[PDB]
Amino acid sequence: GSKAVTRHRRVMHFQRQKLMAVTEYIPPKPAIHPSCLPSPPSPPQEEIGLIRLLRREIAAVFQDNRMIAVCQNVALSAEDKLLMRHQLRKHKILMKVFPNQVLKPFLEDSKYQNLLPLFVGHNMLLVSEEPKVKEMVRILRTVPFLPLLGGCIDDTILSRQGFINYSKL
Amino acid sequence: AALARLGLRPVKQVRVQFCPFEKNVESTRTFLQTVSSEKVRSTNLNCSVIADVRHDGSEPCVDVLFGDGHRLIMRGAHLTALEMLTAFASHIRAR
């Protein structure tokens, strides 16, 4: 003789249980699964203002600075990297880092199309307004582990040996 | 940081030659970055990492000379950075 409200789930009458089973939620089923059908693309959000500013900075740097070189930024210690950056700043070689995703359209739509393969992986730019290739080369040589990935001097693409010989010129 | 934990103590020298203008040097450059990481170099100060950037056009190569006098050659034309690192670690453990 249990009451209407019990601490345990009371056993239902068999007819009531059959009624509950029959009146069960049947979810709608599409004829074809949506994942097995083409999905129209969704328009992405507008370009970020930071991305636009990065594009403007990249364009300004490439338009103004004459000595442009790409170097694979090896995982040096922060103190030594800052010291090398200060040494470059002594000879006005301002090291710049920009995202490859932002940089790629500029290179593709600019005169620097052939420089695209040089920007795979962690890379920085040793750019100076005036050609100081000898100082840049000796600073690169100070750290043998840190390489020089060629570059482009005065709208003229050169390899590492070309950069070496430009200072001798 | 398996490479850093293992260290470069039995490794006399590591040299990586790659042409940046080529497109198959991606794995080689990733391996160079991993080896030139500050921890890996600081594990063994005797070992030196050399970078050879050339416009010759040859396939990228990695030559590791160990303290035992043996050498390990890994050509990055059709090898991945993870595979090269695994081979490097295996040879370091062997030597």
């Binding site: 005169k111 620097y112 199309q113 052939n114 420089l115 060629g150 482009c152 709208d155 003229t156 693409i157 050169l158 390899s159 040996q161 070309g162 | 203008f21 050339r54 416009h55 010759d56 056009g57």
Partner: peptide, 11 residues
């Protein structure tokens, strides 16, 4: 428009 590629050191 696009700058010419760097000549090979061998050449």
């Amino acid at each position: 428009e696009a700058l010419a590629g760097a000549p090979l050191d061998n050449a």
